């Protein structure tokens, strides 16, 4: 079965006996759910995202059912804006990225060509938009705010920017600002024909 990326890849999961909606997120190493009660011992941890770091409760070896597939692994609970299923559980359910096939054991990092430079970027199904580390691109831009796990960052929005990803041509909006990682979001993933599959 094959999930396209024109919309957010939201799915129903079952966890601690309850149903929830969560985002299938190739850009997350770990699974992070909104504040909730889970049984058992937990340890405090910190994780980072596009807007900085947050404190979470780490629960180990928690059963989670996703698209009718059973995973058992680490679930973090804290002030995430969206429930996200990260690579720790996506691998357990046999999910891959396809366009060639890309497995999710490690961060799905690939080379992109943009504005005459070659960069390494993260194929991120949990990003609406593409966000590149600071660079002085020519052209008209407008300011924008974009959010994620620890809050918001200010970025520059450039439109109709030609990109090439894994030999595939795309052209779209690129946001530029102080992101810790270059991110390829769904706006461009849909253009190069990328899907999630399991």
């Amino acid at each position: 079965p094959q999930i396209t990326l024109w919309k957010r890849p939201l799915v129903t999961i079952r966890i601690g006996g309850q149903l929830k909606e969560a985002l299938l997120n190739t850009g997350a190493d770990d699974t992070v759910l909104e504040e909730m009660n889970l049984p058992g011992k937990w340890k405090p941890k910190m994780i980072g995202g596009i807007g900085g770091f947050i404190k979470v409760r780490q629960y180990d070896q928690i059963p989670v059912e996703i698209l009718g597939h059973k995973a058992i692994g680490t679930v973090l609970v804290g002030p995430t804006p969206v429930n996200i299923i990260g690579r720790n559980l996506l691998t357990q359910i046999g999910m891959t990225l396809n366009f060639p096939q890309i497995t999710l054991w490690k961060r799905p990092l690939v080379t992109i060509r943009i504005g005459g430079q070659l960069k390494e970027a993260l194929l991120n199904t949990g990003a609406d938009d593409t966000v590149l580390e600071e660079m002085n691109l020519p052209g008209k831009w407008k300011p924008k705010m974009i959010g994620g796990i620890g809050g918001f960052i200010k970025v520059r929005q450039y439109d109709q920017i030609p990109v090439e990803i894994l030999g595939h041509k795309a052209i779209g909006t690129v946001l530029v600002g102080p992101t810790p990682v270059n991110i390829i979001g769904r706006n461009l993933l849909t253009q190069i024909g990328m899907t999630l599959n399991f």
């Binding site: 969206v82 996200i84 959010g147």
Partner: peptide
């Protein structure tokens, strides 16, 4: 405008 990158 939601960018859910997460690193552990």
């Amino acid at each position: 405008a939601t960018i859910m990158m997460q690193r552990g």
